[PDB]
Design an enzyme around this catalytic site. Structure first.
Site, PDB file in Angstrom:
ATOM      1  N   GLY A  15      10.636  77.402  53.407  1.00 10.13           N
ATOM      2  CA  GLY A  15       9.193  77.414  53.456  1.00 10.13           C
ATOM      3  C   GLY A  15       8.362  77.953  52.395  1.00 10.13           C
ATOM      4  O   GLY A  15       7.149  78.679  52.954  1.00 10.13           O
ATOM      5  N   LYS A  16       8.862  78.243  51.277  1.00  7.09           N
ATOM      6  CA  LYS A  16       7.903  78.931  50.145  1.00  7.09           C
ATOM      7  C   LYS A  16       6.752  78.161  49.836  1.00  7.09           C
ATOM      8  O   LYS A  16       5.660  79.180  49.798  1.00  7.09           O
ATOM      9  CB  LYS A  16       8.911  78.969  48.888  1.00  7.09           C
ATOM     10  CG  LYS A  16      10.454  79.665  48.959  1.00  7.09           C
ATOM     11  CD  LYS A  16      11.279  79.403  47.660  1.00  7.09           C
ATOM     12  CE  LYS A  16      11.480  78.099  47.145  1.00  7.09           C
ATOM     13  NZ  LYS A  16      12.416  77.263  48.364  1.00  7.09           N
ATOM     14  N   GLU A  41       7.150  75.982  41.561  1.00  8.33           N
ATOM     15  CA  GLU A  41       8.369  75.371  40.817  1.00  8.33           C
ATOM     16  C   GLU A  41       7.924  74.111  40.415  1.00  8.33           C
ATOM     17  O   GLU A  41       7.130  73.194  40.965  1.00  8.33           O
ATOM     18  CB  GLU A  41       9.278  75.541  41.597  1.00  8.33           C
ATOM     19  CG  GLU A  41      10.608  75.712  41.255  1.00  8.33           C
ATOM     20  CD  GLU A  41      11.681  75.930  42.226  1.00  8.33           C
ATOM     21  OE1 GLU A  41      12.639  76.566  42.060  1.00  8.33           O
ATOM     22  OE2 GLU A  41      11.922  75.002  43.062  1.00  8.33           O
ATOM     23  N   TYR A  80      21.918  65.847  41.342  1.00 10.93           N
ATOM     24  CA  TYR A  80      22.578  65.520  42.582  1.00 10.93           C
ATOM     25  C   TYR A  80      23.692  64.478  42.700  1.00 10.93           C
ATOM     26  O   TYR A  80      24.572  64.313  43.623  1.00 10.93           O
ATOM     27  CB  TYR A  80      21.405  65.444  43.819  1.00 10.93           C
ATOM     28  CG  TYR A  80      21.099  66.840  43.965  1.00 10.93           C
ATOM     29  CD1 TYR A  80      19.716  66.815  44.442  1.00 10.93           C
ATOM     30  CD2 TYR A  80      21.764  68.016  44.201  1.00 10.93           C
ATOM     31  CE1 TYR A  80      18.715  68.243  44.642  1.00 10.93           C
ATOM     32  CE2 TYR A  80      20.957  69.223  44.522  1.00 10.93           C
ATOM     33  CZ  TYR A  80      19.682  69.189  44.600  1.00 10.93           C
ATOM     34  OH  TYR A  80      19.175  70.868  45.202  1.00 10.93           O
ATOM     35  N   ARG A 103       9.919  81.238  42.866  1.00  9.28           N
ATOM     36  CA  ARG A 103      11.399  81.437  42.537  1.00  9.28           C
ATOM     37  C   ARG A 103      10.826  82.419  41.034  1.00  9.28           C
ATOM     38  O   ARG A 103       9.799  82.114  40.463  1.00  9.28           O
ATOM     39  CB  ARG A 103      12.150  80.372  42.412  1.00  9.28           C
ATOM     40  CG  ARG A 103      12.623  80.035  43.888  1.00  9.28           C
ATOM     41  CD  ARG A 103      14.066  79.397  43.795  1.00  9.28           C
ATOM     42  NE  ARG A 103      14.596  78.948  45.046  1.00  9.28           N
ATOM     43  CZ  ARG A 103      14.639  77.475  45.443  1.00  9.28           C
ATOM     44  NH1 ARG A 103      14.300  76.612  44.623  1.00  9.28           N
ATOM     45  NH2 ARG A 103      15.026  77.115  46.522  1.00  9.28           N
ATOM     46  N   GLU A 144      11.372  80.985  62.753  1.00 10.49           N
ATOM     47  CA  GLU A 144      10.576  80.301  64.058  1.00 10.49           C
ATOM     48  C   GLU A 144       9.502  79.742  63.175  1.00 10.49           C
ATOM     49  O   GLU A 144       9.071  79.658  62.018  1.00 10.49           O
ATOM     50  CB  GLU A 144       9.989  81.740  64.797  1.00 10.49           C
ATOM     51  CG  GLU A 144      11.025  82.410  65.627  1.00 10.49           C
ATOM     52  CD  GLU A 144      11.947  81.588  66.276  1.00 10.49           C
ATOM     53  OE1 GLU A 144      11.780  80.790  67.285  1.00 10.49           O
ATOM     54  OE2 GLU A 144      13.343  81.394  65.852  1.00 10.49           O
TER      55      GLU A 144
END
Ligand SMILES: Nc1ncnc2c1ncn2[C@@H]1O[C@H](COP(=O)(O)OP(=O)(O)O)[C@@H](O)[C@H]1O
Ligand SMILES: Nc1ncnc2c1ncn2[C@@H]1O[C@H](COP(=O)(O)OP(=O)(O)O)[C@@H](O)[C@H]1O
Ligand SMILES: Nc1ccn([C@@H]2O[C@H](CO)[C@@H](O)C2(F)F)c(=O)n1
Ligand SMILES: Nc1ccn([C@@H]2O[C@H](CO)[C@@H](O)C2(F)F)c(=O)n1
Ligand SMILES: [Mg+2]
Ligand SMILES: [Mg+2]
Lengths: 229, 229
Positions: A14-15, A34, A55, A97, A209
């Site tokens: 949730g950044k 980012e 990936y 980050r 939450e």
């Protein structure tokens, strides 16, 4: 002069959600996301998607990805320092980050998972050391905010956002990244080459939450942490 | 203040042989060899041999090689500029190749031979542009010396030196590199992103004959070229 704060957290913790509510609490605050868009559409300053390449075949593409990711972060973070924030009254820059998570969480995990070999990991660390020696001080952190969430919560949040490149990520990978975050930022037992980081203040916020219910108490804790710096 | 001259030439044309006789013609002259040793024994500032990795499987390793090669060249060339040559009377620094041959001869040839894909070639050019924007001016050239030799002569000279990593290189590869050198430095039809290069003075020396017999006439031509700069 500009205070610099890194927001750290696992994939989908949730950044960005958390960042998207910062600028409205104060006009002197700015955010450096980012630069994921330089990563999914590779273009010079319809390109390839280097996130997807990593990936699909991480043993082939992790070195190339990790090197580009971090160069592109440094460029974006330097562009924000040297822009109009430079001339505000009480400027604060929040980074989504840092160069430290690039190396000590993500690149490190890929090397330990044999997705980079010894040669790639040596070249990567050499490049990282050198890039930080040229730009380290301008980007030095005054504080860290850790958004802590379980790997299971993160896996659900990948599903909620629906970012195409991330849909195949398994819980096992998120759990590896979780334990590296906990070592670095909760236990503070992860050793790095940047001595000041062991004393940088950290604010840990549990974000498991629903954001709607937790918002007000989070804001207060951030406002108080920032007063101490 | 320091005059900077690049010595260019194909694999085994005689750049190091030619450089190994420069310092004795004047105490104010210095040389920056290609940092091949950082390439065959990869170590942080018994490692891997990234030169060998590229020749064994160029489609896997050319991007990683080409990126490291050029970073390591910039670091070595900057270290020489900022050392004791800085305080001589008439300082001249001779570079064994340049950041321009890295990109426009070697990296370009590998991309055209499908040893880098579009994504790798885009990331490489982006990195090259940016690194030169930060350090371009300190490294700008005052002149170029082209040591011109046939690809066949070069193939014989690879055999003479006996460098292990090079023994498998085929004539076809040397001939590709030859025609790029001729386009850039003889015909001057190779287009780059660095406008000043089209007017930089070039001295072309034919080095197909034995060095022992040609030495004296080469030296005179170099001394005269340098007077004009
Ligand atoms: N605390 C939360 N409660 C409910 N949903 C959240 C919460 N935090 C994030 N989300 C949702 O989870 C997904 C990922 O959030 P995002 O901010 O993109 O994470 P990150 O930037 O850390 O990758 C999005 O669908 C977002 O709405
Ligand atoms: N002009 C020349 N005549 C005879 N031998 C040469 C000549 N130039 C170079 N050599 C030999 O050819 C080999 C390659 O030379 P070197 O200087 O290592 O080339 P480079 O630095 O361009 O790769 C060595 O064995 C060297 O002695
Ligand atoms: N150094 C980094 C930084 C981030 N990432 C990946 O980028 C995507 C967007 O956060 C996420 O999928 C991700 F976080 F994992 C990465 O692999 N390495
Ligand atoms: N940018 C560069 C520069 C040089 N090289 C290779 O390095 C070895 C030593 O000159 C030679 O084998 C070589 F010249 F080919 C390369 O592949 N790419
Ligand atoms: Mg985000
Ligand atoms: Mg040489």
């Amino acid at each position: 002069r500009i205070k610099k704060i890194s927001i750290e957290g696992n994939i989908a913790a949730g950044k960005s959600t958390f960042v998207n509510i910062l600028k409205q609490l104060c006009e002197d605050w700015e955010v450096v996301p980012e630069p994921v868009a330089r990563w999914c559409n590779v273009q010079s300053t319809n390109g390839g998607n280097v996130l997807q390449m990593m990936y699909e075949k991480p043993e082939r593409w992790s070195f190339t990805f990790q090197t580009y990711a971090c160069l592109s972060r440094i460029r974006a973070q330097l562009a924000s320092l040297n822009g109009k924030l430079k001339d505000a009254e009480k400027p604060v820059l929040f980074f989504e980050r840092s160069v430290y998570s690039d190396r000590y969480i993500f690149a490190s995990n890929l090397y330990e998972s044999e997705c980079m070999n010894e040669t790639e990991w040596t070249i990567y660390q050499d490049w990282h050391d050198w890039m930080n020696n040229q730009f380290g001080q301008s980007l030095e952190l005054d504080g860290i905010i850790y958004l802590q969430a379980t790997p299971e919560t993160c896996l659900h949040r990948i599903y909620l956002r629906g970012r195409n490149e991330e849909q195949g990520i398994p819980l096992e990978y998120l759990e590896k990244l979780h334990y590296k975050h906990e070592s670095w930022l909760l236990h503070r037992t992860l050793k790095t080459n940047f001595d000041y980081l062991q004393e940088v203040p950290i604010l840990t916020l549990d974000v498991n939450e629903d954001f709607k219910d937790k918002y007000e108490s989070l804001v207060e804790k951030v406002k108080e942490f920032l007063s101490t710096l």
